[PDB]
Amino acid sequence: SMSYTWTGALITPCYATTSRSASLRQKKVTFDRLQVLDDHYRDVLKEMKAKASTVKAKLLSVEEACKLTPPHSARSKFGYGAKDVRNLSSKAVNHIRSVWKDLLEDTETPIDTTIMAKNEVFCVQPKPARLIVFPDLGVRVCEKMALYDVVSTLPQAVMGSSYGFQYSPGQRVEFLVNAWKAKKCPMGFAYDTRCFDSTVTENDIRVEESIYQCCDLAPEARQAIRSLTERLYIGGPLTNSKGQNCGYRRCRASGVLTTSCGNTLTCYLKAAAACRAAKLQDCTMLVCGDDLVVICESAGTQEDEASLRAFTEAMTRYSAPPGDPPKPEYDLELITSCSSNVSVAHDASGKRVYYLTRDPTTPLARAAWETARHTPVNSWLGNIIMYAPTLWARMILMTHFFSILLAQEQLEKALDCQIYGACYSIEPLDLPQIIQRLHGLSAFSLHSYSPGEINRVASCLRKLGVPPLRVWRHRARSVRARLLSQGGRAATCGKYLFNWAVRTKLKLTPIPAASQLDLSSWFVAGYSGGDIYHSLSRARPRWFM
Numbered sequence: 156s157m158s159y160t161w162t163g164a165l166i167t168p169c170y171a172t173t174s175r176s177a178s179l180r181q182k183k184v185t186f187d188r189l190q191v192l193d194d195h196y197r198d199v200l201k202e203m204k205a206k207a208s209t210v211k212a213k214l215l216s217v218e219e220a221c222k223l224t225p226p227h228s229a230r231s232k233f234g235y236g237a238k239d240v241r242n243l244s245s246k247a248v249n250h251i252r253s254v255w256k257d258l259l260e261d262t263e264t265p266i267d268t269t270i271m272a273k274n275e276v277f278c279v280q281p282k283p284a285r286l287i288v289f290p291d292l293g294v295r296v297c298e299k300m301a302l303y304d305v306v307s308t309l310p311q312a313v314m315g316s317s318y319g320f321q322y323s324p325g326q327r328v329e330f331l332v333n334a335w336k337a338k339k340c341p342m343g344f345a346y347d348t349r350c351f352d353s354t355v356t357e358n359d360i361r362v363e364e365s366i367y368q369c370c371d372l373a374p375e376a377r378q379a380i381r382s383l384t385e386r387l388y389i390g391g392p393l394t395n396s397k398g399q400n401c402g403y404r405r406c407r408a409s410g411v412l413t414t415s416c417g418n419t420l421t422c423y424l425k426a427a428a429a430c431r432a433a434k435l436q437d438c439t440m441l442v443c444g445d446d447l448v449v450i451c452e453s454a455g456t457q458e459d460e461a462s463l464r465a466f467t468e469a470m471t472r473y474s475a476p477p478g479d480p481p482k483p484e485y486d487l488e489l490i491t492s493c494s495s496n497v498s499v500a501h502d503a504s505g506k507r508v509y510y511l512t513r514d515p516t517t518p519l520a521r522a523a524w525e526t527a528r529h530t531p532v533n534s535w536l537g538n539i540i541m542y543a544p545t546l547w548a549r550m551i552l553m554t555h556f557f558s559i560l561l562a563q564e565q566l567e568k569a570l571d572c573q574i575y576g577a578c579y580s581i582e583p584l585d586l587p588q589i590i591q592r593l594h595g596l597s598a599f600s601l602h603s604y605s606p607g608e609i610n611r612v613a614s615c616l617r618k619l620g621v622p623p624l625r626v627w628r629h630r631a632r633s634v635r636a637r638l639l640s641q642g643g644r645a646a647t648c649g650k651y652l653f654n655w656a657v658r659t660k661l662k663l664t665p666i667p668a669a670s671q672l673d674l675s676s677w678f679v680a681g682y683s684g685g686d687i688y689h690s691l692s693r694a695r696p697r698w699f700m
């Protein structure tokens with residue numbers, strides 16, 4: 156069937172890719188899907204289901220679900236919105252309860268979804284706007300009641316170490332490095348699917364439900380999953396921001412709770428089956444939704460090229476064709492997944508340290524847009540957290556925004572940021588502890604960066620007309636000195652975040668308050684969607700902090 160059917164009703168909104176480039180994206184994401192399954196697919200599916208069987212999932216309370224809603228979450232087309240939900244207002248709560256009852260009692264009627272354009276700031280290179288399909292706020296809260304515990308527990312149970320969203324940046328790197336080292340002679344590749352959400356057939360979505368149905372579920376939770384699959388997840392009518400009917404969807408909705416989970420499960424299912432079809436030897440897989448990386452045992456350049464075509468043919472048969480055809484790589488540092496690559500530096504004692512990086516052009520262009528126009532959910536803070544070990548995040552991002560926060564006297568003001576579609580509320584003052592927990596103390600004392608990484612950062616600054624690295628070193632020294640002079644977490648920010656800027660470096664000891672921090676949710680909800688709000692809370696602060 157067609158992934159989408161359009162009535163021609165324009166996708167109405169509320170360089171930066173606007174609502175006029177949304178028509179180009181529509182042509183790409185619209186096509187009929189061909190899917191042919193085989194024994195490999197059925198075997199992996201059965202193996203997956205067997206692991207799912209071990210799971211027991213709890214049914215969340217109205218109250219529990221509400222508290223997981225981001226405060227910037229799209230207001231209900233029923234006269235309430237996010238704040239009302241988060242504060243458990245009689246209007247919001249009573250509507251959620253009705254939605255839930257309707258899900259328990261109505262099993263066929265399609266649930267309406269709103270189609271919109273995501274306005275992402277990219278660089279002016281001399282790309283069509285990404286689409287966002289999501290149900291009403293009330294439905295989104297019910298989704299959480301029924302499947303939050305499933306999506307939190309199930310994926311790790313089924314895929315183990317292959318589940319991509321269970322890792323802190325440091326952990327992911329450690330997994331990757333260990334996997335590459337484990338192989339006698341390793342080969343690795345990244346498989347990018349062309350329009351993954353669109354390639355997701357209605358059968359894929361029912362196969363996904365068959366996995367959820369292996370949990371020990373409450374009868375209400377079971378029916379909710381059943382109704383949500385038929386009425387919402389397999390498809391339904393599309394409605395623009397104005398309320399006019401846009402068309403119909405018969406593929407994955409980006410704005411649903413089961414998007415990263417389902418996409419992960421599906422991608423994994425298809426890929427693992429394709430690994431068998433291509434007879435790839437001793438595969439280690441890492442799956443982050445539509446994004447996948449395979450670290451297997453090399454069998455020679457020509458055979459590796461051959462294996463990979465077989466892999467692609469199988470994936471294509473499973474209705475998961477590639478965007479770009481995969482290239483076999485023989486250096487871990489040469490694989491690019493989630494716009495990222497593994498790089499290496501030295502800690503304060505000269506020991507090797509691997510870390511994830513990326514081309515800084517987009518992060519910097521977006522941060523530049525964000526400094527100009529006030530944004531509710533910023534990328535710069537997410538990039539600071541995600542790329543804390545990187546040369547560019549440390550010298551340009553940390554320096555620029557700490558000087559700004561210093562001026563505006565807003566270091567203590569919690570901000571909302573997105574880290575690959577996930578929403579987090581962070582006080583910039585908590586960055587050292589956050590960084591220490593996600594990357595380790597070495598993030599604060601990395602040096603001896605590769606020439607390649609230094610040159611990419613340098614070139615990129617010239618390209619964007621950003622002052623050079625020597626300017627940033629100078630500016631960071633003022634910021635450091637100012638933050639130090641303020642004590643507490645501010646001085647910690649100066650000491651730890653800006654040690655790179657000082658002539659003769661300080662010995663850095665573990666931040667004691669970093670252990671108090673509870674980061675549970677970050678791991679158990681790392682998904683590139685879900686309408687999940689991860690905040691920051693610390694179990695019992697010691698008085699002297």
Ligand SMILES: O=C(O)/C=C/c1ccc(NC(=O)C2(NC(=O)c3ccc4c(C5CCCCC5)c5n(c4c3)CC(=O)Nc3ccccc3-5)CCCC2)cc1
Nearest residue numbers: 519520521522523524526551552555619620621622623626
């Ligand atoms: O060779 C030497 O010895 C010295 C050279 C030198 C060159 C330029 C300066 N620039 C400045 O002082 C000013 N801007 C900046 O000091 C500046 C800071 C951050 C900038 C950023 C981003 C960096 C990441 C966080 C957000 C801000 C961009 N641009 C920046 C400019 C240049 C700009 O204007 N816009 C963009 C556009 C796209 C991408 C980046 C930028 C302020 C007054 C005049 C312009 C200073 C010294």
Ligand SMILES: CNC(=O)c1c(-c2ccc(F)cc2)oc2ccc(-c3cc(C(=O)NC4(c5ncccn5)CC4)ccc3C)c(F)c12
Nearest residue numbers: 322323324441443448490492493495496574575677678681
């Ligand atoms: C198969 N692709 C991957 O696994 C990823 C690769 C990759 C490149 C080369 C290569 F050779 C192999 C692999 O690079 C990435 C960069 C980034 C991400 C990534 C990281 C986080 C994330 O860390 N989010 C936080 C967090 N999460 C959990 C716990 C705590 N904190 C900071 C908030 C969340 C989502 C994503 C998409 C990724 F998956 C990947």
